[PDB]
Design a protein around this ligand. Structure first.
Ligand SMILES: N[C@@H](Cc1c[nH]c2ccccc12)C(=O)O
Ligand SMILES: N[C@@H](Cc1c[nH]c2ccccc12)C(=O)O
Lengths: 252, 252
């Protein structure tokens, strides 16, 4: 995949490879986050102790928004595969731009489910992957920086669905043009879903959950929980991105 | 290991478990960096296309130096296990300070091999883990961020020598005080060298390298290379840390 050669990107064999690459990535990031307690205070807005000056919002938000502003100056968000968490906070780059071709439809950057991703990460994911409940006062920084790594991988994996959608669109213009014009979300859903491919994915994740992080010489991740996160969070939100992208495909 | 309870830190068994957890983190991060080319320009100071406003140094240095300043404001370098690449840039934290009791000698912060770590990583590690030689101008930022992750992990595992050296100095004060007095570098070296354990680590590394990153149902990391990195880079620079620390123990 070369984001300057449209044809390597809109290649489904390639898209598949990247998603695989991305799942191992997410797993590694989950295993690192698993070494700390849940640290409820890292996520509370304006927590009594972790009180950031001139700042409403959480300790995580501060660390994340700040990372984004730095990265944005170094062209982080010009790339079609990178979606910001604080879109309103990011700056313009001070580096010469890379003239990315127009691969996805021009409204692509508006399809942004990051608010929802940060929310379920905090509410449904931290609980299943953290070491124990409660604050670990000496590791709030270790925790937030790990949270950002997890959030950014999930966000890309999930937003990758825009690429997946376009690739599916090109392969059967007639089918998707019918569905899109008639706003048949159920038809789009039914079509972009492959129950046999998902089954395989969930199987792969269980075995990867079983061999990763564990010294080959007990389990940093609970297989059931990793499968649960994919089945209930990652896969479903990716389809939400896909159908939203498609319904606006033939707009202007 | 709680850096506010001295008795937990100077526990050889606790130290050994920490280092073993760091192995996995280093491996995971090598796998991540491995997806990209060598990107020589990221490491080149003031490179034509990667010219940053009001800054001398590489793309890597800007990204790293900015991360540390940010993290220092939120107490990152108050922790004894964190050593910065840019000591003269970090600032005081704006959050209430955690009172870490003195555990290592007062001069511990002065033992900082981060420069050597950055050079060997660039010159000897990158060529061994990268996908291919050459610049990939669409991934300089993605590359710089994977590098930081690698460096911060390498830096923490290597400077943990400081803690290893002390727990040992306590464990056998008459001997080490003897060696330190007559500056028996070879003796401290031999005394700190735990041979039969080194073979074990290397066997564990080979096995982990063989299992992580690969779909359990490809070898992202070459085991022989991981063994070479630890055998010639990590384990040896850790010892130079231990040694420099010990030679200045009674220097007060
Ligand atoms: N891959 C793109 C976008 C990107 C990802 N992470 C980044 C961090 C900094 C700057 C850019 C990026 C690049 O390397 O430019
Ligand atoms: N573990 C310490 C120091 C630390 C490690 N990584 C950090 C990143 C940001 C801030 C602090 C840290 C803490 O969380 O406070």
């Amino acid at each position: 995949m070369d984001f300057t050669k449209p044809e390597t990107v809109l290649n489904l064999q390639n898209i598949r490879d990247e998603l695989v690459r991305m799942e191992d990535s997410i797993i590694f990031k989950f295993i690192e986050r698993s070494h700390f307690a849940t640290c409820p205070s890292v996520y509370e807005a304006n927590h009594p102790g972790l009180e950031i000056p001139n700042f409403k919002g959480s300790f995580l938000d501060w660390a994340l928004s700040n990372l984004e502003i730095a990265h944005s100056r170094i062209r982080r968000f010009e790339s079609p595969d990178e979606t910001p968490f604080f879109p309103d906070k990011i700056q313009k780059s001070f580096l010469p731009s890379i003239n990315y071709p127009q691969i996805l439809a021009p409204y692509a950057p508006e399809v942004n489910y990051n608010d929802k991703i940060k929310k379920v990460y905090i509410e449904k994911i931290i609980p299943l992957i953290s070491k124990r409940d409660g604050d670990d006062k000496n590791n709030f920084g270790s925790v937030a920086t790990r949270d950002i790594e997890c959030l950014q991988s999930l966000s890309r994996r999930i937003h990758f669905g825009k690429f997946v959608a376009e690739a599916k669109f090109q392969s059967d213009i007639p089918l998707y043009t019918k569905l899109i014009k008639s706003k048949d979300v159920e038809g789009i859903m039914k079509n972009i879903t492959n129950s046999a491919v998902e089954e395989k994915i969930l199987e792969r994740l269980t075995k990867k959950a079983e061999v990763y992080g564990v010294d080959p010489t007990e389990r940093r991740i609970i297989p059931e929980y990793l499968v649960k996160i994919y089945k209930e969070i990652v896969i479903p939100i990716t389809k939400e991105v896909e159908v939203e992208y498609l319904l606006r495909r033939l707009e202007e």
